[PDB]
Amino acid sequence: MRECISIHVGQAGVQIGNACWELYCLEHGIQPDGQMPSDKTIGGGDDSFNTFFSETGAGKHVPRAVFVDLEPTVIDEVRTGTYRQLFHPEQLITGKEDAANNYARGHYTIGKEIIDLVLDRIRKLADQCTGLQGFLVFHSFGGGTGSGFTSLLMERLSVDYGKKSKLEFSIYPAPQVSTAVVEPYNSILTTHTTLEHSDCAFMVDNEAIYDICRRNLDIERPTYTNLNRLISQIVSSITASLRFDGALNVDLTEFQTNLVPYPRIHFPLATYAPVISAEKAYHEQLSVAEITNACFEPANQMVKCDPRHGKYMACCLLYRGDVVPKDVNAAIATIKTKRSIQFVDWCPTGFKVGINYQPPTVVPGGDLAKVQRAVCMLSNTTAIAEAWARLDHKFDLMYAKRAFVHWYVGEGMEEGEFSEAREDMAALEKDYEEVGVDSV
Amino acid sequence: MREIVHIQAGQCGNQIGAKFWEVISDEHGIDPTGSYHGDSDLQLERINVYYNEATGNKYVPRAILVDLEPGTMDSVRSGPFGQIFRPDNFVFGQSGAGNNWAKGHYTEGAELVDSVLDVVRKESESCDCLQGFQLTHSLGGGTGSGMGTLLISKIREEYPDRIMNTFSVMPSPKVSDTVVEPYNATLSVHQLVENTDETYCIDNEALYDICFRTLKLTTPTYGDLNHLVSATMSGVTTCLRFPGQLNADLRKLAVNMVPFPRLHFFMPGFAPLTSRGSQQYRALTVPELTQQMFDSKNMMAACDPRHGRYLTVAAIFRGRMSMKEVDEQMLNVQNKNSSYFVEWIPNNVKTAVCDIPPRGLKMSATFIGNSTAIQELFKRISEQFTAMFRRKAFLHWYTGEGMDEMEFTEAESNMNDLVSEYQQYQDATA
Amino acid sequence: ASVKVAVRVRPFNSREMSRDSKCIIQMSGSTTTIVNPKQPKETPKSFSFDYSYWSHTSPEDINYASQKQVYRDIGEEMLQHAFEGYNVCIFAYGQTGAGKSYTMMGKQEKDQQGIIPQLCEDLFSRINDTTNDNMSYSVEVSYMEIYCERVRDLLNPKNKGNLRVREHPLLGPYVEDLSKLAVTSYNDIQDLMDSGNKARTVAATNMNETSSRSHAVFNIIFTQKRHDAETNITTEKVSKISLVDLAGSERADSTGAKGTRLKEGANINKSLTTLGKVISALAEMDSGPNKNKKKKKTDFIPYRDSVLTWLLRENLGGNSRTAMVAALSPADINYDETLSTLRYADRAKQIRCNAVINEDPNNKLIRELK
């Protein structure tokens, strides 16, 4: 059987997990208290889909999750909220203090004494698990606890398990806006972690999702709840193939091998096509061709990165709902006909296609219209490199004068670690530059 | 669980502490008798930060009241919230320092510091995980400056890892209530720069300007100034007591605001301030809060930000609001006033958001600035110090207590070096 | 001034021998090449020091730099150059177990001695050579250590308190009540060094079994007088020679220190960073006015950020000659640390200060009054 374990780190990770588990509980008809009336009504089937929820004797369904944080506030918000009965009481909270936007505190000094408990809980879940597929790690660059503890946790996980897949969903720092001064340092110091240990890292920018909300859904003052709900929709579209039936199903491994031409270039961009409000849901056909075309629009990208400035190394489409392969083939042919989408000359195949019968579900109180069709597109392209270059500039502007360095050095980190991380990032940029050159 | 130990010394420190304990007590629904008569559950979620549980189901603030004159202690006890403080934390003597820094630091305070540290050591030992301390004291006086600096030094020796805040009142440019303000100010600033993590600068001239120009009060008293200060202190530590979209402890600010160890002098501010009758006209929104936060006349430090450059600022919002609006407003403030922010710190605006506003308001905001203009204040003090040290105007009162001219020279040199360090980055084009 | 970054490579160590023991440092004359163990195909990092040395193969003589060569290239040259009224600052910047003591002291019993034996014995023999009725000298020494922003005395008996750092308005920073001594001979200096080295705090770590967890300073104040009273003025020279040992940067990943050890390491790294910053700043400042235009508008050097730079304010820059010995290792684990050290060397090696001081006012007052 098929199952995967979700790990959430930091405030961003915990809140995205709240949204994700709301969506999953809505999807499988599980009440907030863990009970499912459907078993009494339907009396059959597999409504307790084991990909996420473990079933106990009394009919309760405990999610396969491990929340982690250093501030008691964020986890305590969950432990006395609507879903207080859903989760196992083991929430793995450090009751000392937050890392304070510091990589060293999250990785060297305070990250210790808590890594052991997290690994013990994850080992218990793995032993309880059969046919484990992989890990889904949620965290955020820039933040101290997310960066440092994700680094430490991934370092331990690569040793303990090794061959199990590890998909990473992360929030990259924005190009213009930001909520911290030391964001570039924390973001740069995670390059080693994201390179060596992670198997595939998905990146999303707050500015892009704000623009999507402003333009598509017509929301004038969106907050983090809408962002988390959209990210939850992305993850649900990714992981749907393991649960509901489909015509062309794509598990995590076959998804992975079709997106990474080389080991070091596992940074795909993600996008969701039918982001539309209830008012504008009418006056729209939302056929397969329309959503497929809208996937490639520059405005709908989830990261502030123009794909027209680079080449598409690979693409993977995951459709949900009333979809037939004929329309998918027609849309793929139409996309290949276009000029503005430039593909590398060494990937003639181009696209991977998957189709699932379960349509997306509408969370009550949400901002997404009920639609019969949807599609999520995950594309490995070169243009992401440009975004990294921007961040690199900021790092230099703060490292020439050694601003804020003493905070990091006073927590056990050495100064040369900054230069090592910068050199690794430059090597990654050079690798992304070399791969995009046309063969001769 | 993160606990803050509060200390207050001198008349000004004790007054501000009394007003501050009245404000926080309301936010967390605490009766003057100590019993809890609130309505919301969240009031008791993090009560432990400032209060200790008593055996009779009443809450005692974790405060240390310090002085060298029983008059202020008697005034505090015979007050609206005098009964809230436990009697064992009233540490005092007699024969106050009397505006003599040497008496506060060397002669008189040395006899009483032991007792004070003992209470502090006790209060600290009970806490589960101490975040840091905070001290309120005016630098212009004797008891405040002397005993505050001595306690800060001793505590930093005892607790190197913890955080040390300070809400100190600097001497004003024009207003001067004492003749020997510059001496005490110089020595206190010499002591503070070495042994503190943060230091919020407050000036009575700025607070009077706020009371007159903004609030339109006709006859302000020290109660209103203490009200403003206490509002700021309650605003600073909001994230350690309520949930929010983005949390921000005291350390997260210290990390984000202090680029180099010696630059930890901050300019505080608060918004809104509607002046009791104009609130019906203005609509309370995030852009209005940002505008009033970044205004020059709203600052409490009596130093124009436009005469320097912002090294880094932090905004702590309280209330229900959207993150997009806050982020775009901070970005617009950066882009419009491009010349007043340094160029080698991209995105130098920290943001924190809490979703439990003050009881009487829909939204509020606290501003903490770190700019190069603050050097002006120190520069001014230095001039006055020189004007009295060339001729040794009142030196015989200090040297009689054991100090010597050498220490004055060290203090002046350190102050000048701090001013030069701040002036290093206030430039253009490099 | 100068810094004369003595890039030195020592023999292998048991921890290194446990790994693939292959040196990654080579040279040709003044050219120093460092191979990347992880990228041997790449062209090795190349630097041009006149003072790069290689003692990993001690018995060799082909392109072998003995300690006498190091002294000739740095020691007597720097001494005589700074002899005309300067302050000389020799300090050891390096890493843990990076052989920072053999540079400083070396084999006392052998003729392959460190910098201090050669310098002190050469100076002492020089003054003895010029000892006469009308030519006399006077030498004083002092020892101190910095644990964690706290100064302690090593020569004086156990004083559990920490000495208070003061600032004389004319003479600059100094240590209150620090024990100072007068010395007549070189063997006395050796004995005092032995006592001070024993007195310091020491702890063991993986990279080195006897790592020093403090920053040690050894000051020498040396005065010279000639008494041809008819046509000469007594006390015609004084010099300040400062010899400092600096605990190396604590690579926490390569040591795994915990508890108090970690705290010490933390402080050490902080101090080192400040020192590096000063050495990066000072250089640029002295490079700007001396070369560019002579403007001298204003330049700020952050001395006060740490006790080490504060106490060495007179010696690190301003009006002092300096010296660094970059104690490298031939290991692959230390390639990044060596690169950092020599990159700060690239931000050093001139410093360019000015001096000429130490007249005798009272002796010339005889001629003035007469």
Ligand SMILES: CC(=O)O[C@H]1C(=O)[C@@]2(C)[C@H]([C@H](OC(=O)c3ccccc3)[C@]3(O)C[C@H](OC(=O)[C@H](O)[C@@H](NC(=O)c4ccccc4)c4ccccc4)C(C)=C1C3(C)C)[C@]1(OC(C)=O)CO[C@@H]1C[C@@H]2O
């Ligand atoms: C009709 C109406 O709008 O009433 C308001 C009001 O007029 C204004 C002017 C209030 C009023 O404040 C003042 O008049 C004032 C005078 C001198 C110094 C400071 C304030 C108010 O008193 C203050 C009061 O707010 C509070 O009480 C806050 O919760 C405040 N707590 C206290 O002031 C307090 C005092 C004693 C004991 C316990 C609490 C607070 C602020 C920050 C953090 C924690 C608590 C409010 C909304 C009002 C009145 C009543 C008129 C303002 O209060 C603040 C927080 O500054 C002045 O600026 C705001 C803007 C408000 O519009």
Ligand SMILES: Nc1nc2c(ncn2[C@@H]2O[C@H](COP(=O)(O)OP(=O)(O)OP(=O)(O)O)[C@@H](O)[C@H]2O)c(=O)[nH]1
């Ligand atoms: N998209 C999105 N981003 C978020 C959300 N919450 C926080 N973030 C981002 O996460 C970053 C910091 O997150 P955290 O690491 O969790 O911060 P923290 O929990 O206080 O812990 P420290 O970072 O160590 O201080 C911020 O810069 C935000 O931009 C969210 O709900 N949605």
Ligand SMILES: Nc1ncnc2c1ncn2[C@@H]1O[C@H](COP(=O)(O)OP(=O)(O)NP(=O)(O)O)[C@@H](O)[C@H]1O
């Ligand atoms: N050129 C050399 N020839 C022979 N032996 C040497 C040479 N240089 C160093 N050594 C030896 O290598 C060791 C270097 O000393 P070491 O134990 O590393 O002290 P240290 O590293 O300087 N202490 P520290 O660097 O402050 O942590 C000693 O055993 C020396 O005798």
Ligand SMILES: Nc1nc2c(ncn2[C@@H]2O[C@H](COP(=O)(O)OP(=O)(O)O)[C@@H](O)[C@H]2O)c(=O)[nH]1
């Ligand atoms: N804001 C405010 N300032 C005060 C108050 N009382 C005194 N001050 C200021 O404090 C200074 C005198 O310091 P003082 O309290 O006497 O110090 P101490 O004698 O050492 O305790 C004066 O310059 C006043 O402006 C007060 O209640 N509120």
Ligand SMILES: [Mg+2]
């Ligand atoms: Mg975090």
Ligand SMILES: [Mg+2]
């Ligand atoms: Mg050594």
